[PDB]
Design a protein around this ligand. Structure first.
Ligand SMILES: [Mg+2]
Ligand SMILES: [Mg+2]
Ligand SMILES: [Mg+2]
Ligand SMILES: [Mg+2]
Ligand SMILES: [Mg+2]
Ligand SMILES: [Mg+2]
Ligand SMILES: [Mg+2]
Ligand SMILES: [Mg+2]
Ligand SMILES: [Mg+2]
Ligand SMILES: [Mg+2]
Ligand SMILES: [Mg+2]
Ligand SMILES: [Mg+2]
Ligand SMILES: [Mg+2]
Ligand SMILES: [Mg+2]
Ligand SMILES: [Mg+2]
Ligand SMILES: [Zn+2]
Lengths: 98, 102, 53, 213, 70
RNA sequence: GACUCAACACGGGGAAACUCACUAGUUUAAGACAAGAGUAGGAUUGACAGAUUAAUAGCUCUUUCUUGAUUUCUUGGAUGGUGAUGCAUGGCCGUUUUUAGUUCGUGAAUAUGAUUUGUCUGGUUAAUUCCGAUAACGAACGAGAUCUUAACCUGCUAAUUAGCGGCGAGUACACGUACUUGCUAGCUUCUUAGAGGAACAUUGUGUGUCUAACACAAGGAAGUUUAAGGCAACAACAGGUCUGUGAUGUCCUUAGAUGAACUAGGCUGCACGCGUGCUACACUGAUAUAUAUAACGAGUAAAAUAUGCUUGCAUACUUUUCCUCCGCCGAAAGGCGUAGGUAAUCUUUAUCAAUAUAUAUCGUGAUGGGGAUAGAUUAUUGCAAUUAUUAAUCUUGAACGAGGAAUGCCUAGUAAGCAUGAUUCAUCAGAUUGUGCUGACUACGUCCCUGCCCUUUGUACACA
């Protein structure tokens, strides 16, 4: 713990967010950067906002916004990218696909 | 065993019909049933302005949300009344069962 | 250090906002609605309020 | 343990927000309403639309995602207590929301306004509808905005009957050069249950019966 | 409303001066008298967290523990 | 921003910070993605001490440790904006207009046409509401009907978190009355709330074409559709709003930002002009004591109270945060300790107010009328009260003696007088929006002024 600047996402935070998104299928993000943490996830809310923003620009999620929330959904390329990134066997599927 | 049935709802038809059905259904079993108690009706009021902007004559509108409540007592078992209560009620009425032994 | 968002904001107009717009003006606080007046006049029917007289 | 007033307000707000979310998600599927049955055991949502097939998805894949999103937004504490069901509208020629969405979808493809309006008129009227009205407002061709009205049959405006026997919706379409508003009004074929629910007819009629002979 | 008036040039940002292979100045080893630490080691940080040899004190860059020279 | 009605206690606009859009400064990246560069022999991140800064922003400098590919530099490309445009638009609202208006089929005027008639001389109504006359005969929206609240019911259905009554034990009086208290036949007057009923101009008398209707009397809870509201046709305005909006087109701007924040200031500054109001000019009063008497309401992720340690940490989310009875302290404001209540159950309402009523003092005197402007001390909200947040005590004691030319609202439980609950709200109502209490005078009309409408008429007007 050397106390870097706020919004300097470590590798572990990104790994946790990717794991959650792959296991679960979807994610709700709550656009507000002043919240300390996510309901299901012990990470600064700004980090989740930044990562999910980055995924949408590359066409790995689809999102659409109702008043005060984000509602992201994963593509098929999202699944493939997350297998390649996280090194999971070619059998695992997200929970929505069952 | 001094069981009390309590009903609340926004709709007058709905809760009146549910009360009638419960009252008639419990009387097919020959049970001492206390007639429904209609508590005072309570109204929620908001008085807001029209006109998103601020010009023109100043007009208002008055909004109302009123709540009804019924109340039924009877001597029976817990399982009997909890079966009789639940027959997939019109889900706009709330039903809750309490034991008033004291 | 950082001086970002460090002013105390526990009370006052700067603390709460609209549940829908995020605006900070003419908020309904009665019964904890927490919607400004315009959105409420748009949504009052489905919320449960009626016009009788 | 909050009081009754706050409980009812909470139900109203939750209803409104869920409805708006679902109307945004299922735009291209003829979305028409939502019904919620909140038991403390489980809560069940019942969606109403025209195209149930493409709402459901491939072996129900889309509806599972909808359930997961609705749960993570509104029932965060638990894990599996919410499920959804899709139903199809019986008579889509009298659902104003469906007709307004259809007109929007038509107008987004560049088709002419007048043909679309006469088409929707002819479609509504053949379902037995007693009257209908369609209005389109904005920059139609020129740079100065205009309104166009299209009517058929019989329609009421004032009183309490006009709120029972008429069905209304509004939608907007973003064209390249502005926004257009769409406004549909359908009078139902003498079909309206009452506040003391029973099939009514009309507060304006005094038929006199014929003596038996 | 008006365009600014700039009479004073910009405040400059902070760059970090660079030293090539500074670690080879921290340990040096002879043939006799093997490896000898040239800076000193911390107290509550995992071993190898060295601290600055300042003009009058020693400073740990990771926990900011200051020990005054005297 | 808005400038006749239809701007000027309006933008729910009562701004100490925030809000905030304005003034003076200082930080931040929370600059997607793509391409090139740079680089593990280190891209970049953070910071003690001294200086330096309003500042405990390592902001920057000296000094020299930490960090590990998250970032950094270049060109594109997105994103945000209470920035411009309501004369580019959506939606919503105001106004014409709460008036009584608007259209269609067939026939006729045609024997060119724009277009007429139907939709009217007259009587009648709140009403193109009806009767009736008739080159027209029939239809539709608007009006009416419908909906909500109020007024009647000793008849129906009900008894809790409502009452009354029944049975005992007392405390005092008169030979039953008032109050306290333990318990619990029956009933629905009082309280609550569901279903029904009741008025139709009924009956009598008059006016009218004896049609459509109007007036008076009797009965009746009620006889101006019984009272008040909500809804609101066809057609319009360059009416207002992009400063309500992840409604939006175009134009600007985008690292020395017009993005997002942090510190201080301003929106409240005062020779003057205008609109809405509060308090008064006294005796039908002021002050002081005492008696009696309402209705609609509201109410429960953070900081805060307690061991080991040198103003900080780890700890129960075990108490507390909203209305607050009661007890004690204090002239008062208020403070301390402890109940009940997520509420027909407690605060608190067989009563939470003030006009009223009774008795005394003052005595026509800018006076014991009036209470502006100033001095001093004390409390509470808040991180912070100075340009004085609000409240408490003593002191000071201005204009004003009924208001010129002008001009507003109003017909019955109404005007006026009198207080109160909610909205905003950490703290602040002389403002809105509801509620009740005391309760008049004058008319029962007209077309004179003002406005709106219809017919005939003139027109060189049609942005009228
Ligand atoms: Mg329009
Ligand atoms: Mg009407
Ligand atoms: Mg103020
Ligand atoms: Mg904006
Ligand atoms: Mg305009
Ligand atoms: Mg407009
Ligand atoms: Mg004519
Ligand atoms: Mg009674
Ligand atoms: Mg806007
Ligand atoms: Mg500021
Ligand atoms: Mg001002
Ligand atoms: Mg005096
Ligand atoms: Mg005085
Ligand atoms: Mg105000
Ligand atoms: Mg006149
Ligand atoms: Zn809003």
């Amino acid at each position: 713990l050397p106390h870097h600047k706020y919004s300097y996402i470590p590798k572990q935070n990104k790994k946790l967010i990717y794991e959650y998104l792959f296991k679960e299928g979807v994610i709700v993000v709550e656009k507000d950067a002043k919240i300390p943490r996510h309901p299901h996830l012990n990470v600064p809310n700004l980090h989740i906002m930044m990562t999910l923003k980055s995924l949408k620009s590359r066409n790995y999620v689809e999102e659409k916004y109702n008043w005060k929330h984000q509602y992201f959904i994963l593509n098929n390329e999202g699944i493939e990218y997350l297998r390649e990134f996280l090194h999971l066997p070619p059998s695992i599927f997200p929970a929505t696909l069952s | 065993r001094r069981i009390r049935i309590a009903l609340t709802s926004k709709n007058l038809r709905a809760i009146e019909k549910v009360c009638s059905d419960i009252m008639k259904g419990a009387k097919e079993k020959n049970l001492n049933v206390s007639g429904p108690v209609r508590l005072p009706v309570k109204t929620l009021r908001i008085t807001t302005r029209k006109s998103p902007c601020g010009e023109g004559t100043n007009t208002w509108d008055r909004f109302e949300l009123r709540i009804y409540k019924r109340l039924i007592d009877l001597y029976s078992q817990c399982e009997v009344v909890t079966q009789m209560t639940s027959i997939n009620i019109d889900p706009v009425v709330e039903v809750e069962v309490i034991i008033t032994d004291s | 250090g950082c001086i970002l968002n460090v002013h105390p904001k526990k009370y006052g107009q700067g603390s709460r906002q609209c549940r829908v717009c995020s605006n900070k003006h003419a908020i309904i606080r009665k019964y904890n609605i927490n919607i400004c007046r315009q959105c409420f006049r748009e949504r009052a029917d489905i919320i449960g309020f009626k016009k009788y007289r | 343990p909050i009081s009754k007033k706050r409980k009812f307000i909470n139900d109203g707000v939750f209803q409104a927000e869920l409805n708006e979310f679902l109307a945004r998600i299922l735009a291209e599927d003829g979305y028409s309403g939502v019904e919620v049955r909140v038991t403390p055991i489980r809560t069940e949502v019942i969606i109403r639309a025209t195209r149930t097939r493409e709402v459901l998805g491939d072996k129900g894949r889309r509806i599972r995602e909808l359930t997961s999103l609705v749960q993570k937004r509104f029932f965060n504490k638990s894990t599996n207590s919410v499920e959804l069901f899709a139903e199809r509208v019986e008579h889509r020629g009298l659902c104003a929301m469906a007709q307004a969405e259809s007109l929007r979808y038509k107008l987004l493809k560049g088709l002419a306004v007048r043909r679309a309006c006469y088409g929707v008129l002819r479609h509504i009227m053949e379902s037995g509808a007693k009257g209908c009205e369609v209005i389109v407002s904005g920059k139609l061709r020129a740079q100065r905005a205009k309104s166009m009205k299209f009517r058929d049959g019989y329609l009421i405006s004032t009183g309490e009957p006009s709120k029972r026997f008429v069905n209304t919706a509004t939608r907007s379409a973003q064209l390249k050069q502005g926004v257009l508003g769409i406004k549909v009004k359908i009078m139902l074929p003498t079909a309206i249950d009452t506040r003391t629910g029973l099939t009514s007819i009309l507060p304006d009629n005094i038929s006199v019966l014929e003596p038996k002979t | 409303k008006k365009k600014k008036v700039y009479k004073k040039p910009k405040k400059e940002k902070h760059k970090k001066k660079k030293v090539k292979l500074a670690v080879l100045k921290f340990y040096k080893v002879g043939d006799d008298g093997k490896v000898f630490r040239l800076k000193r080691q911390c107290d509550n940080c995992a071993p190898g967290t060295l601290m600055a040899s300042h003009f009058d004190r020693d400073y740990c860059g990771r926990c900011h523990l200051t020990i005054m020279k005297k």
